[PDB]
Structure formats: C-alpha cells, structure tokens
Coordinates of C-alpha atoms and ligand atoms in Angstrom, one line a residue:
X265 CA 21.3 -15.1 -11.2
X266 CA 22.1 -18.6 -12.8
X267 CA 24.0 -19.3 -9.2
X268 CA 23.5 -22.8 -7.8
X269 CA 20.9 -24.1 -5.9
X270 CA 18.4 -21.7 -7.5
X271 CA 15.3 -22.8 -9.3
X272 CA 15.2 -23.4 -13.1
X273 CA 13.6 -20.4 -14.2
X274 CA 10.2 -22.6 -15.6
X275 CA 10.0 -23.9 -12.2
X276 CA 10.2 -20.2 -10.1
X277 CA 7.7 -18.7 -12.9
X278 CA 4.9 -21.9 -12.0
X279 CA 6.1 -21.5 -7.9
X280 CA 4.8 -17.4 -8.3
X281 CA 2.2 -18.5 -11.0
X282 CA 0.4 -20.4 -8.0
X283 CA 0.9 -17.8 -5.2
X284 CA -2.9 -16.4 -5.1
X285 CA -2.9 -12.2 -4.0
X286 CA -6.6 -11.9 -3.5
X287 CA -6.7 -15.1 -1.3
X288 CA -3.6 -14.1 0.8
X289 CA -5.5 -10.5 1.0
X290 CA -8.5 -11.7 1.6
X291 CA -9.0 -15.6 2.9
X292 CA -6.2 -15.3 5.0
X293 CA -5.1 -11.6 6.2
X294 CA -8.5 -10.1 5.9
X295 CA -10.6 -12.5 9.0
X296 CA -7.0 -11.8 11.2
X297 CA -7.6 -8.4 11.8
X298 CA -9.1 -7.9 14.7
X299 CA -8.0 -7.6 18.6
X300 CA -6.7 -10.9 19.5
X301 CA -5.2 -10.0 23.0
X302 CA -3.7 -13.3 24.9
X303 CA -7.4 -15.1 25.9
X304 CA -9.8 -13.2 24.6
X305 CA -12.4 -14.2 22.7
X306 CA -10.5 -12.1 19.8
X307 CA -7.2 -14.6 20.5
X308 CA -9.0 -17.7 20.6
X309 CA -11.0 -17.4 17.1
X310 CA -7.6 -16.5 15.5
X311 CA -6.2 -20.0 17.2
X312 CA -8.7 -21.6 16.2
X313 CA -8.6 -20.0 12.6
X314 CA -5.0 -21.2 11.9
X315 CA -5.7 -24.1 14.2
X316 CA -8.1 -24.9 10.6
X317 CA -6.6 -23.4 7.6
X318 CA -3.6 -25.7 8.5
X319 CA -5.8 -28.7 8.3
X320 CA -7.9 -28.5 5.7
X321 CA -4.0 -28.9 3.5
X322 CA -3.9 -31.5 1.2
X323 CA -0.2 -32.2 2.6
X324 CA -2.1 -32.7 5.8
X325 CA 0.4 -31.4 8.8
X326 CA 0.1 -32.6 12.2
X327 CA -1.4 -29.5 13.7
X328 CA -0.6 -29.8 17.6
X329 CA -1.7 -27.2 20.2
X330 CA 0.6 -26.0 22.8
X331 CA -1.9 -24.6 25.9
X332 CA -0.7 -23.8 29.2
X333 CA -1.2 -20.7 32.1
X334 CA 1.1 -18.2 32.8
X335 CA 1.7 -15.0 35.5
X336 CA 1.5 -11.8 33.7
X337 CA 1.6 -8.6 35.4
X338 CA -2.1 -8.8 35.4
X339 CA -3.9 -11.9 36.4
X340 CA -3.0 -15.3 35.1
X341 CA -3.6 -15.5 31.4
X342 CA -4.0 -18.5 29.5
X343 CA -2.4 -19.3 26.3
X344 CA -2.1 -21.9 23.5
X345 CA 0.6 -21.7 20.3
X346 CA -0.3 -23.5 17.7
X347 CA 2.3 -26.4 16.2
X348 CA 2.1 -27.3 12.3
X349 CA 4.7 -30.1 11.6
X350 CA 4.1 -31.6 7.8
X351 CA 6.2 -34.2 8.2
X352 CA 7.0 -34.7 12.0
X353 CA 8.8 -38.3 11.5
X354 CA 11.3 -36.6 9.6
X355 CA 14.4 -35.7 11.0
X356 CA 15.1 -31.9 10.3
X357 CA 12.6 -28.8 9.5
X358 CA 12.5 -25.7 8.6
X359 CA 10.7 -23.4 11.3
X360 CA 9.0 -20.4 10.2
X361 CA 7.3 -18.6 12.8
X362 CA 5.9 -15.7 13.6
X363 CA 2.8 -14.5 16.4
X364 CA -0.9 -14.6 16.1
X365 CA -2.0 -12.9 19.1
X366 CA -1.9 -8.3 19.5
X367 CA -0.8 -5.7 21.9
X368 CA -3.4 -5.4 24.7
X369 CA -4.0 -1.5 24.6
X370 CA -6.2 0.2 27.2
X371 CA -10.1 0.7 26.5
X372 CA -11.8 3.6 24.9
X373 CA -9.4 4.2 21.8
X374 CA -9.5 3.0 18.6
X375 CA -9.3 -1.3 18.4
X376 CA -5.3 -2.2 17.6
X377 CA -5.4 -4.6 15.6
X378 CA -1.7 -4.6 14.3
X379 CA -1.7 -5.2 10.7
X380 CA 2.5 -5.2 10.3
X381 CA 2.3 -6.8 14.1
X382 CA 1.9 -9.8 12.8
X383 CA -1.2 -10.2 10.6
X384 CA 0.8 -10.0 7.6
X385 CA 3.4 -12.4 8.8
X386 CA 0.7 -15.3 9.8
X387 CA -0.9 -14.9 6.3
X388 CA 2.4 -15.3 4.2
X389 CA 3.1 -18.6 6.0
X390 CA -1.0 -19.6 5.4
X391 CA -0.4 -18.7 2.0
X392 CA 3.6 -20.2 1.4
X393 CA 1.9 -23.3 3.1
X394 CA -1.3 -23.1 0.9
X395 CA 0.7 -22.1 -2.9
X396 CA 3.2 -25.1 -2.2
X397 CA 0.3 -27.7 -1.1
X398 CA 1.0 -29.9 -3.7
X399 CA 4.9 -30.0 -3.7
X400 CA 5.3 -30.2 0.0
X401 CA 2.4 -33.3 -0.3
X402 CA 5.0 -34.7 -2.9
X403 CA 8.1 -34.6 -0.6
X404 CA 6.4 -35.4 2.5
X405 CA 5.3 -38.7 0.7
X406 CA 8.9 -39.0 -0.9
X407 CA 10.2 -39.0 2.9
X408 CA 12.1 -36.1 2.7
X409 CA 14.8 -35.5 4.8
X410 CA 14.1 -32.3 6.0
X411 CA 10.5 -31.1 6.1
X412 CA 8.8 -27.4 6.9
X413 CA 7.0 -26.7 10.5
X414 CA 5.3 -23.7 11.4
X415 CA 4.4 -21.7 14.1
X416 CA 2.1 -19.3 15.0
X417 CA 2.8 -18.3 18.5
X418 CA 0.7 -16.9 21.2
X419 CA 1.7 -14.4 24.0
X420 CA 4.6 -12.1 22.4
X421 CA 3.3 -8.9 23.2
X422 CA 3.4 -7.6 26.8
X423 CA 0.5 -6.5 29.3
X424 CA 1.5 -3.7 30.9
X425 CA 5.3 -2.5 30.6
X426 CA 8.0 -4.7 28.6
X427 CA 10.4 -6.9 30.0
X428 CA 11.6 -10.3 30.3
X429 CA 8.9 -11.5 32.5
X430 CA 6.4 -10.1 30.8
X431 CA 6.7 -10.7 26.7
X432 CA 7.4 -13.8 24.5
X433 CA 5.2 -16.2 27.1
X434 CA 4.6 -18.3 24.3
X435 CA 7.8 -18.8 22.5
X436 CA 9.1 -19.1 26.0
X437 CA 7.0 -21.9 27.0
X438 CA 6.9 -23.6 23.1
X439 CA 11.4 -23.7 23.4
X440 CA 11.1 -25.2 27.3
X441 CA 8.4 -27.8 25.5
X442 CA 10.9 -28.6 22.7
X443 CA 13.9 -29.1 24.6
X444 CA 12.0 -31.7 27.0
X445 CA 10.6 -33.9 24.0
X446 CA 13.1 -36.5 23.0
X447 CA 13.4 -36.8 19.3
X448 CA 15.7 -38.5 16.8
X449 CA 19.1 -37.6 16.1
X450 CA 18.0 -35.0 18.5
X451 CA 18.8 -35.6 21.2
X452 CA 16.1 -32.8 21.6
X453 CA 13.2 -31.5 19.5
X454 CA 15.2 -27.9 19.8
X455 CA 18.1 -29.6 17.7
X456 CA 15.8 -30.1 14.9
X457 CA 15.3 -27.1 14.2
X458 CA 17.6 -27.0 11.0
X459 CA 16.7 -22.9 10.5
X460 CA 14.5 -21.3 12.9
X461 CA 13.0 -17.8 10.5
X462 CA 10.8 -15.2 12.5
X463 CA 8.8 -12.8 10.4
X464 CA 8.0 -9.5 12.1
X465 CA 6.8 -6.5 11.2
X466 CA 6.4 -7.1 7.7
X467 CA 4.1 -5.0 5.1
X468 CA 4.4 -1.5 5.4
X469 CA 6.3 0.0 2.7
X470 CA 9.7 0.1 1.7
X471 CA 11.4 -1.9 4.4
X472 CA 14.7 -2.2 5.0
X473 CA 16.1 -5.6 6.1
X474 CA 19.5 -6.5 7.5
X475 CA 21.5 -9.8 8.1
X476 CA 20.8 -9.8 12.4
X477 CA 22.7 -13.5 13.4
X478 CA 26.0 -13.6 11.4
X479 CA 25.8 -17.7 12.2
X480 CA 22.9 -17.3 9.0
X481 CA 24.1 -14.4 7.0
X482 CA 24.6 -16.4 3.9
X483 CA 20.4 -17.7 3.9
X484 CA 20.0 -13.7 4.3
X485 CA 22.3 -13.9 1.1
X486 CA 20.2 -16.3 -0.8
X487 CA 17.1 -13.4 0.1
X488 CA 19.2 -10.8 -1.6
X489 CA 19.4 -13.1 -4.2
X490 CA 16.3 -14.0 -4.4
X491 CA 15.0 -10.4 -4.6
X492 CA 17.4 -9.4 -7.8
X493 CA 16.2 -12.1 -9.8
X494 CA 12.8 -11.3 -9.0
X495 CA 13.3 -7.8 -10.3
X496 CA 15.0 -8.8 -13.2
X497 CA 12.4 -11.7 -14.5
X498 CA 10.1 -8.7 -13.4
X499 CA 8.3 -10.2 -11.0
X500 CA 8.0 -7.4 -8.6
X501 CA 5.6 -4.7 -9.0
X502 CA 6.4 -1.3 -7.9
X503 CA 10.7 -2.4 -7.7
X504 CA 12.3 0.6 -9.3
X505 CA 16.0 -0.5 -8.1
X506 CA 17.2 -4.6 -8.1
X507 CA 17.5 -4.3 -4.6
X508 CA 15.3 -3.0 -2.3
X509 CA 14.2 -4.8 0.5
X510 CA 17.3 -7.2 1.4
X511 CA 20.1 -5.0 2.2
X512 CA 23.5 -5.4 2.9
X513 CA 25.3 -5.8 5.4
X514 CA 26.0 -6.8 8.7
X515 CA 24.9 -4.4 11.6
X516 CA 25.0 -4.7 15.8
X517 CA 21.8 -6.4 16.3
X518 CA 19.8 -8.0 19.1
X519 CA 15.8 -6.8 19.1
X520 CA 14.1 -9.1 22.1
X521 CA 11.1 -11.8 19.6
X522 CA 10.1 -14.9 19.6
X523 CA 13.5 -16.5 18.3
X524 CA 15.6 -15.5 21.9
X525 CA 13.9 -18.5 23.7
X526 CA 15.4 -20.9 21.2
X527 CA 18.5 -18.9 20.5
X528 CA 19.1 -19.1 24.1
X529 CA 18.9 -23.2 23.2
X530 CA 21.6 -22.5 20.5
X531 CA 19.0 -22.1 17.6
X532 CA 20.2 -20.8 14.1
X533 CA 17.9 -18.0 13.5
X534 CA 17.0 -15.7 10.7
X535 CA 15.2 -12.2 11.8
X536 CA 13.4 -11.4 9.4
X537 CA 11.8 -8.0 10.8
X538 CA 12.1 -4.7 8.9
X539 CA 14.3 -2.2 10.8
X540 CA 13.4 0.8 10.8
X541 CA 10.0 -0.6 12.4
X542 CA 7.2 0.9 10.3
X543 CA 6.2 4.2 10.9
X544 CA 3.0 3.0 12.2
X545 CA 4.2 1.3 14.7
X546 CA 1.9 0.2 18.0
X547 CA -0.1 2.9 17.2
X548 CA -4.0 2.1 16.2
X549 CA -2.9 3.2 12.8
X550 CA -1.3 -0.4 12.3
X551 CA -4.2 -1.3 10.0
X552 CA -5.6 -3.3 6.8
X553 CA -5.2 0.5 4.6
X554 CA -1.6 1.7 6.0
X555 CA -0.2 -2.2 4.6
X556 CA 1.6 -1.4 1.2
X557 CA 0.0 -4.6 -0.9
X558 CA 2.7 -5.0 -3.5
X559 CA 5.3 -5.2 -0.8
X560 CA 3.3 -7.8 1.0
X561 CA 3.1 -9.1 -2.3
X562 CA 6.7 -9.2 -3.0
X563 CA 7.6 -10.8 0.1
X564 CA 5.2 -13.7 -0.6
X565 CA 6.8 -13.9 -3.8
X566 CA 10.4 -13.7 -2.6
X567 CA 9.7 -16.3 0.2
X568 CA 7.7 -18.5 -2.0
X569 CA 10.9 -19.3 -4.1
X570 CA 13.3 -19.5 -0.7
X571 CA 11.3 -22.0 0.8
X572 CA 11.0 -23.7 -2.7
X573 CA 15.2 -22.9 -3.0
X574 CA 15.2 -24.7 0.6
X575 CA 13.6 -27.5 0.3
X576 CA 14.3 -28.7 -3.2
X577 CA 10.9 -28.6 -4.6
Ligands
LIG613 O1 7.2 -5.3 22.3 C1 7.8 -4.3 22.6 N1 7.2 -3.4 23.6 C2 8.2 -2.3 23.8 C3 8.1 -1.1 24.5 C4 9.2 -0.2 24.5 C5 10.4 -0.5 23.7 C6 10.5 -1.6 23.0 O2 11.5 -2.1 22.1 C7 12.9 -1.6 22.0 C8 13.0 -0.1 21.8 C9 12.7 0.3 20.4 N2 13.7 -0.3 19.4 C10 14.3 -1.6 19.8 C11 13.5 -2.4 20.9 C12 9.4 -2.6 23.0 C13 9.2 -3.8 22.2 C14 10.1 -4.4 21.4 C15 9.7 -5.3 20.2 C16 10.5 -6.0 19.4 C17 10.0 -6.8 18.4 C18 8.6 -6.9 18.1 N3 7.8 -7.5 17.2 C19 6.5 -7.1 17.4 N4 6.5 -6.3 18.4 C20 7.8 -6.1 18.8 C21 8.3 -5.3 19.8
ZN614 ZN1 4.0 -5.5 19.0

C-alpha cells in the first residue's frame, strides 16, 4: 500500500474529496441518456454536449472535432469524434477514450439508450477531467512533459450486422487522422500516444476486470493496487472483499473496440471493459436504474487516483 509512485495519503484523500457523485450522476451522466445513433439529432446534441463541458475547463483543452462521411450498410452516415488535448504542445499524453454515440435498434421498441454502452464511461472522463481542473491547469502551465487527451468517439456501434466494415468508423477514421499528422518526436501523432485506455461497459454491478494486452499488464497492476488501498482507507462503499473489481490474471483476450485501430498502429492499450459484459447487455434494459451507483462511484474514485498516480499531480 506504501509502494512507490503512489499518492501520499493527504493528497489521495483531497483527490476523492473533490470527485462530486451527484454532478457525475447528474450534470454529466443524466443529459447522456438518450438515443444518440451516428447522425441523429440524438448524436449530434451529445457532440455538441461534450463538444462544451470540455470547454468551459479552467485548464482550457484544445477541443478539436474530427467530422467526416462514411459507407455503412445503410446510406452514408456522417460522423464527427470529438478531440480534447489539454496540453497539445506537449510531447506525450495519456489517451483515455471511450464512445459517445448508441446502438441503432429498429423502431417501435423501447428507446436504447445504453447506460453501461458508454454513458457511464463518457461521464467518468467529464468528471476525472472536471475533479482534477485545477491540478491539470497547474501542470499544463508547468509544461509538463506528458499531458492527458481524451476522446469521445463517434461511430462504434454497428448498423445492421457486425463486422469490420461496419463498427468502430470513428476510431477507424480518428487512428488514419493521427498517423497522417506529423508531430514532435513523433514522427506521428499515433506515437504519442504514451497509454491509449478505453473504458467500456462500465457500471453495472460487480464487474470483473482482467489484464487484456500483456504489453500493459503492470498499469492493470497499479488498478489492483489502487482498488486495495481504496478499501482499506475505506473509501469504497458497498466493498466487502479488498479486491473486487481488478482481478488477476492474465486471460486469452481480443474483444473488437475502439482501441484495434490504433493497436493495429502499435498502440499500448489498456481495456478497460468488464468481462462478463453486464447482464443487460444491448438489450433496452441498459438504463439510468439497472447502473449500480456505488460501482460507478468506485470506478471514479479508483481512476481519479490512477490518472493523479500517472501524471504526478
Ligand atoms: O458491437 C458488437 N455487436 C455484436 C454482435 C454480435 C456479437 C458481438 O461480440 C462478440 C460476441 C460476444 N462476446 C465477444 C464479442 C458483437 C459486438 C461486440 C462488442 C465489443 C465491445 C463493445 N463495447 C460496446 N459494445 C461492444 C460490442
Ligand atoms: Zn454496444
């Protein structure tokens, strides 16, 4: 627990002392769900949600939009990600990332809005970005080395029947934009991309996480740390056992997201997608009531140090 590169105590108590439950809940998660389907009037309020939130920061990212077409098994659909950089002269970032738009499900049955698929997600990084306004504002001024970029990314799901040509358009597109944007070292945007960490599925209850990408498996450690540690300084409501969530230890893998388009680019990724997939899956019943709160809680929590952890803040 004392282990090195960990937060003085103080410091972790004051990082979880500013993480705000009813405005993750409720400024954040709350306006998200709602049918978002790639460019639909439901999408585009989202986009431009985020595309807001992000702004208003103190730290003040550059908050870029990535728009472009693309051939679905339907029509052409178009599409826009949405880029938040904090620092973008600096030379490294962390990317966490995770997608904003829902499953397309045909009419006459109850909306999907997909509460696990990714509400949730997209209001932990709103919130991580929003509880460590100030500190990243300090580093970014201090010229950090490495900085934090986010991404909320359009186009994952699927219209019609699953399959490479039909899934992921955005991080597709977002990876073939990197890798033709010179940057410095670089040579590519792509290589600066220290840790690329896609949240998925995330706030039903009692998930089960594994290491996915042996190339990260000791950051997976540092979440299993990070959990314990929680648990002891109880921190963690409804945590019966020290760990929980972050299990050990190295299974198979593979499970097509966002991340293969920059994987395929040689990006170190961390999967962060509970597995078994919530019960609720893709089913309308992936909604605001089936969410377990103190879980979504205690992931906020347990990223809020990690990012903290990362970044030396
Ligand atoms: O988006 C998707 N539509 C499908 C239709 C049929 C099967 C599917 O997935 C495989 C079988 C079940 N276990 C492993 C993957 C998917 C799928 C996969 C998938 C992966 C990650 C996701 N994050 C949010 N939605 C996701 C779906
Ligand atoms: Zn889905």
């Amino acid at each position: 627990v004392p282990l090195i590169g960990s937060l003085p105590e103080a410091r972790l108590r004051r990082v979880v002392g500013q993480l705000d439950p009813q405005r993750l809940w409720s400024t954040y998660l709350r306006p998200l769900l709602v049918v978002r389907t790639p460019g639909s009037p439901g999408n585009l309020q989202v986009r431009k949600f985020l595309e807001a939130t992000l702004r208003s920061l103190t730290a003040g990212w550059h908050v870029e939009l990535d728009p472009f077409t693309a051939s679905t098994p339907l029509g052409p659909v178009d599409f826009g990600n949405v880029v938040a950089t904090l620092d973008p002269r600096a030379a490294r970032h962390l990317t966490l990332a995770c997608h904003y738009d829902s499953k397309l499900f045909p009419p006459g049955s109850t909306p999907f809005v997909g509460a696990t698929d990714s509400a949730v997600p997209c209001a932990l990084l709103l919130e991580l970005a929003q509880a460590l306004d100030l500190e990243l504002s300090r580093a970014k001024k201090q010229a950090a080395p490495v900085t934090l970029q986010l991404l909320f990314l359009d186009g994952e799901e699927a219209l019609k029947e699953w399959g490479p040509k039909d899934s992921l358009y955005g991080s597709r597109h977002l990876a073939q934009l990197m890798e033709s944007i010179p940057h410095s070292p670089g040579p590519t945007r792509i290589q600066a991309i220290e840790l690329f960490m896609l949240l998925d599925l995330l706030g039903a209850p009692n998930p089960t996480f594994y290491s996915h990408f042996p190339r990260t498996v000791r950051w997976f450690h540092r979440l299993r740390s990070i959990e314990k540690r929680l648990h002891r300084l109880n921190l963690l409501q409804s945590h019966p056992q020290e760990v929980m969530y972050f299990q050990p230890g190295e299974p198979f893998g593979s499970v097509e997201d966002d991340h293969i388009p920059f994987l395929r680019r040689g990006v170190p990724v961390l999967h962060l997608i509970s597995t078994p997939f919530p019960a609720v899956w893709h089913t309308p019943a992936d909604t605001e009531v089936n969410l377990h709160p103190p879980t979504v809680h205690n992931l906020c929590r347990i990223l809020a140090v990690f990012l903290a952890e990362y970044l030396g803040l």
